[PDB]
Design a protein around this ligand. Structure first.
Ligand SMILES: Nc1ncnc2c1ncn2[C@@H]1O[C@H](COP(=O)(O)OP(=O)(O)O)[C@@H](O)[C@H]1O
Ligand SMILES: CC1(C)CC(=O)C2=C(C1)NC(=S)N[C@H]2c1cccc(O)c1
Ligand SMILES: [Mg+2]
Ligand SMILES: [Mg+2]
Length: 335
């Protein structure tokens, strides 16, 4: 069963508009196609076109990505599957905007109604909504694990400084599993605990960016939500579901050495070509997320692109990479 791949183009910023930039990207949501102008001036051109599971043009709003991509995944998480969503693309294209979003300016909104909110805050908000009173008892735990230069950092441990690296071990009770020693899991007890947890992470990040060169563009971040669920039948028996969701904001795909990024692409290549050795163990990212790449987790990729002709080569590079990734076969199953 193919993983899901979608594409999102960012809108032009002030600078580009001021320059009367014209888009080289066309997304047709009916055909589910992205089409890129690769040459030719006005009245005759070359184009490259690619079909994906969905396509989101530059005017697409957060709410629409959330309804289309995330809603059905969260439903699956709530059924007790593990899911992963990746954001993939060059720096500046909207990976973080998609996975996190931002605040609407001038304190126009509370966080729960901000139309610029992204996947993470909307998902956490929605979990409490969907499970308010349906007879499922539940707890929600989050962790935020980052990988930079092949070291692991915990962005939510409030009593460790950002300099302290975690260690990873194989998890003996699990072929596909690792243990991250020391990784804080924070219980989010209700919707009114969410925002401040997101705040503490962001502050812990600022610090990281100060210590580590080009941190925000070279790091991979894995924001995990684990939902432990318990139903009681009419006969008093207990039904347990556990769902895990990984929300991954990857390092920029552009262009010193990102071992985890290089390995991710080599993992995809091995999977699509069906070669029997898949090099998961060659990087921390791919050991942690091994079950997401041709294993038992339902995976989606959101590949983010630019409308600007300056970014032509990296745009094509992302589309090609994303398009190949569609042939990855996963076998989701209940926990
Ligand atoms: N769909 C969008 N709508 C409005 N602004 C966007 C969108 N996508 C990206 N941006 C803006 O583009 C800039 C870079 O986006 P960012 O999320 O940091 O990209 P990345 O994480 O891929 O480097 C930011 O100013 C962000 O606000
Ligand atoms: C609260 C912050 C300091 C700044 C910020 O915009 C975000 C943060 C950190 N983190 C989340 S994951 N995305 C966004 C976010 C969170 C909630 C609502 C929103 O519109 C955006
Ligand atoms: Mg980013
Ligand atoms: Mg990142």
């Amino acid at each position: 069963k193919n993983i899901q791949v979608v594409v999102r183009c960012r809108p032009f910023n002030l600078a580009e508009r001021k320059a009367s930039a014209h888009s080289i990207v066309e997304c047709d949501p009916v055909r589910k196609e992205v089409s890129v102008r690769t040459g030719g001036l006005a009245d005759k051109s070359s184009r490259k076109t690619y079909t994906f599971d969905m396509v989101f043009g530059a005017s697409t709003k957060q709410i629409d990505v959330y309804r289309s991509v995330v809603c059905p995944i969260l439903d699956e998480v709530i059924m007790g599957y593990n899911c992963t969503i990746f954001a993939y693309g060059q720096t500046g294209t909207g990976k973080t905007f998609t996975m996190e979003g931002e605040r609407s300016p001038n304190e126009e909104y509370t966080w729960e109604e901000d139309p610029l909110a992204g996947i993470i805050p909307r998902t956490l908000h929605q979990i409490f909504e969907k499970l308010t009173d349906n007879g499922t008892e539940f707890s929600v735990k989050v962790s935020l694990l980052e990988i930079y230069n092949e070291e692991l950092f915990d962005l939510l441990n409030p009593s460790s400084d950002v300099s302290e690296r975690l260690q990873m071990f194989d998890d003996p009770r699990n072929k596909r599993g690792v243990i991250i020693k020391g990784l804080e899991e924070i219980t989010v007890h209700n919707k009114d605990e969410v925002y401040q947890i997101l705040e503490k992470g962001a502050a812990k990040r600022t610090t990281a960016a100060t210590l580590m060169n080009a941190y925000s563009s070279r790091s991979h971040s894995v924001f995990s939500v684990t939902i432990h669920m318990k139903e009681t039948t009419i006969d008093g028996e207990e039904l347990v579901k556990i769902g895990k969701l990984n929300l991954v904001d990857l390092a920029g795909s552009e262009n010193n050495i990102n071992q985890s990024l290089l390995t991710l692409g080599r993992v995809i290549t091995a999977l699509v070509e069906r070669t029997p050795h898949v090099p998961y163990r060659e990087s921390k990212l791919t050991r942690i997320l091994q079950d997401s790449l041709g294993g038992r987790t339902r995976t989606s990729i959101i590949a983010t692109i630019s409308p600007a002709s300056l970014n032509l080569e990296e745009t094509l590079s992302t589309l090609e990479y994303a398009h190949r990734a569609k042939n990855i076969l996963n076998k989701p199953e209940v926990n």
